[PDB]
From Swiss-Prot, chains A, B:
Record annotation: effect of changing residue 96 to T: In CONPM; uncertain significance
Family: Belongs to the thymidylate kinase family.
Statement: the UniProt record of this protein carries the keyword Nucleotide-binding: yes
Quaternary assembly: Homodimer.
Descriptive protein name: Thymidylate kinase
Catalysis performed (reactions): dTMP + ATP = dTDP + ADP
Pathway: Pyrimidine metabolism; dTTP biosynthesis
Gene Ontology MF term list: ATP binding; dTMP kinase activity; nucleoside diphosphate kinase activity
Disease per UniProt entry: Neurodegeneration, childhood-onset, with progressive microcephaly: An autosomal recessive disorder characterized by global developmental delay apparent from infancy. Most severely affected individuals have severe and progressive microcephaly, early-onset seizures, lack of visual tracking, and almost no developmental milestones, resulting in early death. Less severely affected individuals have a small head circumference and severely impaired intellectual development with poor speech and motor delay.
Taxonomy, superkingdom: Eukaryota
Organism of origin: Homo sapiens (Human)
Pfam family, one: Thymidylate_kin
GO biological process, alphabetically ordered: cellular response to growth factor stimulus; dTDP biosynthetic process; dTTP biosynthetic process; dUDP biosynthetic process; thymidine biosynthetic process
Length: 204, 204
C-alpha cells in the first residue's frame, strides 16, 4: 500500500513550512508513516550552490540556476520512490511548481521551457496551494520583493489550470491551527483514496 | 562583424579535441580572432561535479547529471555571446548534441526530454560531425564502452535529421593533417558567410 506524495505550494510567507511540519507531526500521531521533505534540499552539493545563490553570496546565470533547482529534485527521486513504495507518505515543502513559477517570473522565460526539466518527476497525489493576499504575506533572500512575488503568483495561477493535477486551494489567512486542520483533512483523504492508483509522472 | 560559433562533435576518439585545437591555431595564424571552448567545462563548480561523475569518483542520478551538463553550457552563454559579438569565432569541442546523444543512449530517456534543457542556447553556425567507424575509434571514464557508444551514435544520427542546423560530415579516418584541412576550409566558409545573419537559438 503505497504512501501519498503531498506537496505544499504558495507565495512567500503563506505558511508552507509551518504547515508542512505540523502535517507530518499530525499524520504520524494518527498512526501513519509520514516524512517531511523540502525543496531546495540544501544539504547536497547542488543544494549548497542553490543556497549560496538565494543568499546572494553567489550569482548564477538564470537558466543554469533553473536547471540546478530541477536537478536537486531529481537527485531525490530514488529516495522518494523508495519511501512511497514502502508505504511512507511524503509531505513536501515546495516542489516543481515553485521551480516553474519563480524562473517563469523572470523576463524571457516561457512556462513551457521552465516545465521541461521537471517533466517525469514523481507526480504529487495532492498539491495544496496556500492562498494569502500578497499584502498579508508581507505582514508576517533573492526574489523577496513584491513585484517579483506578484509575477510568480501569476505563474502559479497558470499552473493551476492543469487539470491533470489534484490542486486544492487552502485559505491560508486563517490561524495556524485552522489552516492545519483544513490541510490535515485533505491529506487524510488523499492518503486513503489517491493511493489506489500507481504513482504518476509529472507533466507527461 | 560577429564571429562564428563552430562546434565539433563525433563519437569518442574521432579527433574532436585534436581538430578543435588545430582549427583555432590555424584560424589565428590566418588573421582571425578565434578561441577554443570545450564541454563539459570542468573548471566551474558544476564542471567539477561533472568531472567527478565521468571519472566514476561519484555517482549522480541520470536526470540530475543530464541537467548539470546543460547548466554547464548555460553558465558560459554570457561569455559566448560577448565573444561572438566582439568578432571572436568560437571553436567548441562538444556541445548540446553530445549532451543529448549520451543521455539519450540510456534507457528510458527520450530525445525530446533530453533536448529541452538546451533549447535556446546559442545556435552553432556550423556543426562538424567527425565520422569514424566505431572499430577504428577503438584502435586509437564513464560511457567508454562499445555498446554504449553505438547507442550514442544512433542518437547523433537522429539529431542530424534536423535541417535547422548546418551539419557537415567530416571523414575523420584520414590523417590528422588531411582532416584538419577539410575542417579548416569548411570553417573559413562559415566565418565569412554564416555570420551575415544574427546568432540563432538552438532548437527553437
Ligand atoms: N496562518 C498563519 N497566521 C499567522 N502567521 C502565520 C501563519 N502561518 C505561518 N505564520 C507565520 O508567518 C511566518 C512565515 O511562516 P512560514 O511557515 O515560514 O511560511 P513559508 O510559506 O514557508 N515562507 P517562505 O519559505 O519564506 O515562503 C512565520 O513567522 C510563521 O510563524
Ligand atoms: N585522424 C587521426 N588519425 C589517427 N589518430 C588520430 C587522428 N586524430 C586523432 N588521433 C589520435 O586519437 C586519439 C584521440 O584523439 P582526440 O583528438 O583526443 O579525439 P577525441 O575525439 O577528442 N576523443 P574523446 O574526447 O575521448 O571522444 C589521440 O591519441 C589522437 O592523437
Ligand atoms: C523549489 C524552488 C524554489 N525556488 C525559490 C523560491 C523560494 C526559494 C527557496 O526558499 P527557502 O529559502 O525558503 O528554502 O527558492 C526556486 O526559485 N526554484 C525552485 O525550484
Ligand atoms: C558535453 C557532454 C559530454 N558528455 C559526455 C561525453 C563525453 C564526456 C566528456 O569527455 P571529456 O572527458 O573528453 O571532456 O562526457 C555528456 O554525457 N554530456 C554532455 O553534455
Ligand atoms: Mg518556508
Ligand atoms: Mg515540448
Ligand atoms: Mg576529446
Amino acid at each position: 500500500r503505497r504512501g501519498a506524495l503531498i506537496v505544499l505550494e504558495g507565495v512567500d510567507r503563506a505558511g508552507k513550512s509551518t504547515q508542512s511540519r505540523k502535517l507530518v507531526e499530525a499524520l504520524c500521531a494518527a498512526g501513519h508513516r509520514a516524512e517531511l521533505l523540502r525543496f531546495p534540499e540544501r544539504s547536497t552539493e547542488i543544494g549548497k550552490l542553490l543556497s549560496s545563490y538565494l543568499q546572494k553570496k553567489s550569482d548564477v546565470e538564470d537558466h543554469s540556476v533553473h536547471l540546478l533547482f530541477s536537478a536537486n529534485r531529481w537527485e531525490q527521486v530514488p529516495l522518494i520512490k523508495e519511501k512511497l513504495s514502502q508505504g511512507v507518505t511524503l509531505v513536501v515543502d515546495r516542489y516543481a511548481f515553485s521551480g516553474v513559477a519563480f524562473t517563469g517570473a523572470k523576463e524571457n522565460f516561457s512556462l513551457d521551457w521552465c516545465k521541461q526539466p521537471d517533466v517525469g518527476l514523481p507526480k504529487p497525489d495532492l498539491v495544496l496551494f496556500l492562498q494569502l493576499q500578497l499584502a498579508d504575506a508581507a505582514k508576517r533572500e533573492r526574489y523577496e520583493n513584491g513585484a517579483f512575488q506578484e509575477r510568480a503568483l501569476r505563474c502559479f495561477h497558470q499552473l493551476m489550470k492543469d487539470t491533470t493535477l489534484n490542486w486544492k486551494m487552502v485559505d491560508a489567512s486563517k490561524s495556524i491551527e485552522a489552516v492545519h486542520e483544513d490541510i490535515r483533512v485533505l491529506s487524510e483523504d488523499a492518503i486513503a483514496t489517491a493511493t489506489e492508483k500507481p504513482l504518476g509522472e509529472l507533466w507527461k
